[PDB]
């Protein structure tokens, strides 16, 4: 008769195609990409004949075969595709085969194919919306937001987004390359640890712990291969296959390296590191470039040149070429985007009418127009139009869009920015006609986490009562709160101001809307972004 029924022996059942050192601090030691995972299985037979041939089945499919010389045996084979497999050991002879009971084995891969969908209920004031408008609805998630802000990937209202950009991937480089990071306590040192033994101008992960080692919902097992933000983003992609998750390179304190990109050698190394990155972390759908203003005026007062415009265009073209190269290897479609200054002065330093041909979307940073960084000239930080008391205001959302359109940039490429936070001053005085914006400030307003900035969440729950005055500027389309006693003034976006931006986008046929700091919203902002763009309310 057929052989006896074998019993799979105790042993580890978790494997990975892409290995990650959960204790590594340096990016070069953090991950190793393999062409396939090395799986091992053993078995024992206590009743019946061991047969003549032994086979390993994965969901009924043979993955290994060998002579069945003993009552006990071991098999070593490779699995090139990730996922959860029902593994069985089958012993066969001339009379037939006898398969053991199934034992689940997990072959992990950076696409999340081994993880169950991360489908979380909407929190706070977030309401379900369907992405059926055809317009962009994005937001940025911050890597370090999982600490103090305690805002994790499982808290993202992912169903109400079409695009999700990550909390900034840094570019390696120490003194003279990332000096701007030195302004942030221990931030420069953190990058130096991540880039240990890694070449300057190659990308890395700023905080390896938050990105892949910190236990988070869905990836909490002590031995899970991918944890942290990346692990959850992988499970998120499984739940929202259509969601575009993009790694954002740069930001205010990580843009210094771009200014050196004029050197083709460095630029090629960079592009090369980006390709390898995407090849390693399969859940990402492309790359977003957040070069904090080509031409200077960024965090570093010693960087910036008239050549940055040319460098920017070349970079975008070269990245797009690299992505086309990758698409031919994977068959997948990748997106190339960039967050840019909404200021005409900075916009005119780049030929976007040319760069747009290599980009899918342009995230216009129509916010931070005003803030505690200037205690003399106050104004709406993210308004649509200029205020009535100053119709000549340069820094407005409309002026940014017009500047781009004037260059020849297609309207559908422009994604208007919205703020899920407010910027404010304190001790504001010397204002006339009951318009605080006409006076001056003595300093920054008390912030939620840092001075001068407050989460929209806190504005709505604490600054919408008491002595706080509330006023919606219908002209510029922007709200603001003011406390006469202490002279505290805060400028931000609200449900209505967002509505105005959404209608504006639809009328001018722009690309959509995106927001900064998804963790700072209580849901009012993203709901408005969705509603104003025409997305239908979900179940």
Curated annotation (Swiss-Prot):
SMART domains: Glyco_18, PKD. InterPro entries: Chitinase_II/V-like_cat, Chitinase_insertion_sf, ChitinaseA_N, Glyco_hydro18_cat, Glyco_hydro_18_chit_AS, Glycoside_hydrolase_SF, Glycosyl_Hydrlase_18, Ig-like_fold. Coiled coil: none annotated. GO terms for biological process: chitin catabolic process; polysaccharide catabolic process. SUPFAM superfamilies: (Trans)glycosidases, Chitinase insertion domain, E set domains. Gene3D superfamilies: 3.10.50.10, Glycosidases (3.20.20.80), Immunoglobulins (2.60.40.10). It is an enzyme of class 3 (hydrolase). Residues 135-536 form the GH18 domain. The active site is at 292 (proton donor). Keywords: Carbohydrate metabolism, Chitin degradation, Glycosidase, Hydrolase, Polysaccharide degradation, Signal. Its EC number is 3.2.1.14. CDD domains: E_set_Chitinase_N (cd02848), GH18_chitinase (cd06548). It catalyses: Random endo-hydrolysis of N-acetyl-beta-D-glucosaminide (1->4)-beta-linkages in chitin and chitodextrins. GO terms for molecular function: chitin binding; endochitinase activity. Belongs to the glycosyl hydrolase 18 family. Chitinase class II subfamily. This is Chitinase A. It comes from Serratia marcescens. The lineage of its organism: Bacteria, Pseudomonadati, Pseudomonadota, Gammaproteobacteria, Enterobacterales.
């Amino acid at each position: 008769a057929a052989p006896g029924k074998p019993t799979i022996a105790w042993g580890n059942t978790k494997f990975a195609i892409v290995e990650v050192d959960q204790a590594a601090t340096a990016y070069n030691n953090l991950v190793k990409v393999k062409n396939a995972a090395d799986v091992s299985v053993s078995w024992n037979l206590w009743n019946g004949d061991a047969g003549t041939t032994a086979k390993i089945l994965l969901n009924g499919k043979e993955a290994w075969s060998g002579p069945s010389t003993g009552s006990s045996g071991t098999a070593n084979f490779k699995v090139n595709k990730g996922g959860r497999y029902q593994m069985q050991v089958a012993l066969c002879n001339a009379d037939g085969c006898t398969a053991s009971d199934a034992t689940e084995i997990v072959v992990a891969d950076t696409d999340g194919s081994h993880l169950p969908p991360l489908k979380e209920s909407l929190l706070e004031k977030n309401k379900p919306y369907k992405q059926n408008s055809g317009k962009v609805v994005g937001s940025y998630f911050v890597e370090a937001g999982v600490y103090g802000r305690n805002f994790t990937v499982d808290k993202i209202p992912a169903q109400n987004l079409t695009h999700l950009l990550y909390g900034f991937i840094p570019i390696c480089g120490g003194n003279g390359i990332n000096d701007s990071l030195k302004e942030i306590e221990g931030s420069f040192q953190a990058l130096q640890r991540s880039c240990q033994g890694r070449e300057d101008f190659k990308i890395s992960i700023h905080d390896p712990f938050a990105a892949l080692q910190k236990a988070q919902k869905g990836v909490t097992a002590w031995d899970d291969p991918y944890k942290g933000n990346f692990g959850q983003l992988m499970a998120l992609k499984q739940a929202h296959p259509d969601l575009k998750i993009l790694p954002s390179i740069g930001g205010w304190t990580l843009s210094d390296p771009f200014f050196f990109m004029g050197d083709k050698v460095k630029r090629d190394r960079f592009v090369g590191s980006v390709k390898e990155f995407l090849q390693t972390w399969k859940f990402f759908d492309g790359v977003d470039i957040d070069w904090e203003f080509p031409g200077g005026k960024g965090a570093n007062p010693n960087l910036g040149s008239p050549q940055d415009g040319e460098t920017y265009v070349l970079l975008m073209k070269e990245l797009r070429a690299m992505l086309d190269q990758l698409s031919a290897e994977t068959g997948r479609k990748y997106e190339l985007t960039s967050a840019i200054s909404a200021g005409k002065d900075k916009i005119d330093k780049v030929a976007y009418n040319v760069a747009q041909n290599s980009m899918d979307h342009i995230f216009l940073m129509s916010y931070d127009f005003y803030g505690a960084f200037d205690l003399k000239n106050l104004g709406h930080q993210t308004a649509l139009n200029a205020p009535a008391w100053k119709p000549d205001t340069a820094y407005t959302t409309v002026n940014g869009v017009n500047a781009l359109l004037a260059q020849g940039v297609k309207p559908g490429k422009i994604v208007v920015g919205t703020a899920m936070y407010g910027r404010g001053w304190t001790g504001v005085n010397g204002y006339q006609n009951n318009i605080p914006f006409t006076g001056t400030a003595t300093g920054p307003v008390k912030g939620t986490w840092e001075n001068g900035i407050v989460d929209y969440r806190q504005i709505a729950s604490q600054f919408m009562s008491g002595e706080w005055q509330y006023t919606y500027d219908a002209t510029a389309e922007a709200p603001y709160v003011f406390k006469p006693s202490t002279g505290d003034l805060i400028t931000f976006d609200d449900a209505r101001s967002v509505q105005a931006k959404g209608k504006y986008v639809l009328d001018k046929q722009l690309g959509g809307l995106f927001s900064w700091e998804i963790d700072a919203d209580n849901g009012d902002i993203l709901n408005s972004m969705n509603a104003s763009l025409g997305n239908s309310a979900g179940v």
